[PDB]
Protein backbone atom coordinates (compact mmCIF):
# COMPACT_ATOMS: atom_id res chain seq x y z
CA UNK A 1 0.00 0.00 0.00
CA UNK A 2 1.93 3.45 -1.05
CA UNK A 3 0.03 7.23 -1.66
CA UNK A 4 1.54 9.68 -4.13
CA UNK A 5 0.62 13.57 -3.56
CA UNK A 6 -1.29 13.84 -5.77
CA UNK A 7 -2.81 11.89 -8.82
CA UNK A 8 -4.51 13.04 -12.47
CA UNK A 9 -7.51 11.40 -13.26
CA UNK A 10 -9.24 11.93 -16.81
CA UNK A 11 -6.76 14.65 -17.23
CA UNK A 12 -9.03 16.68 -15.03
CA UNK A 13 -9.20 14.92 -11.74
CA UNK A 14 -7.38 14.67 -9.07
CA UNK A 15 -6.53 11.35 -6.11
CA UNK A 16 -4.94 11.20 -3.02
CA UNK A 17 -3.90 7.44 -4.08
CA UNK A 18 -5.79 6.58 -0.29
CA UNK A 19 -9.24 6.61 -1.11
CA UNK A 20 -9.72 10.58 -2.30
CA UNK A 21 -11.00 11.94 -5.15
CA UNK A 22 -11.30 15.78 -6.41
CA UNK A 23 -11.40 18.44 -9.35
CA UNK A 24 -7.89 19.82 -9.98
CA UNK A 25 -5.94 21.81 -12.45
CA UNK A 26 -2.46 19.70 -11.66
CA UNK A 27 -0.61 19.49 -8.61
C1 LIG B 1 2.94 3.57 -4.32
O1 LIG B 1 4.21 2.92 -4.29
C2 LIG B 1 4.11 1.51 -4.59
C3 LIG B 1 5.49 0.92 -4.42
O2 LIG B 1 5.47 -0.49 -4.58
C4 LIG B 1 3.55 1.31 -5.99
O3 LIG B 1 3.41 -0.07 -6.25
C5 LIG B 1 2.20 2.01 -6.13
O4 LIG B 1 1.77 1.93 -7.48
C6 LIG B 1 0.44 2.41 -7.61
C7 LIG B 1 2.33 3.47 -5.72
O5 LIG B 1 3.15 4.16 -6.65
Redesign the pocket.
Given at each position: ????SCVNFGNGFCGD?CGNSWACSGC
Open positions: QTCVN
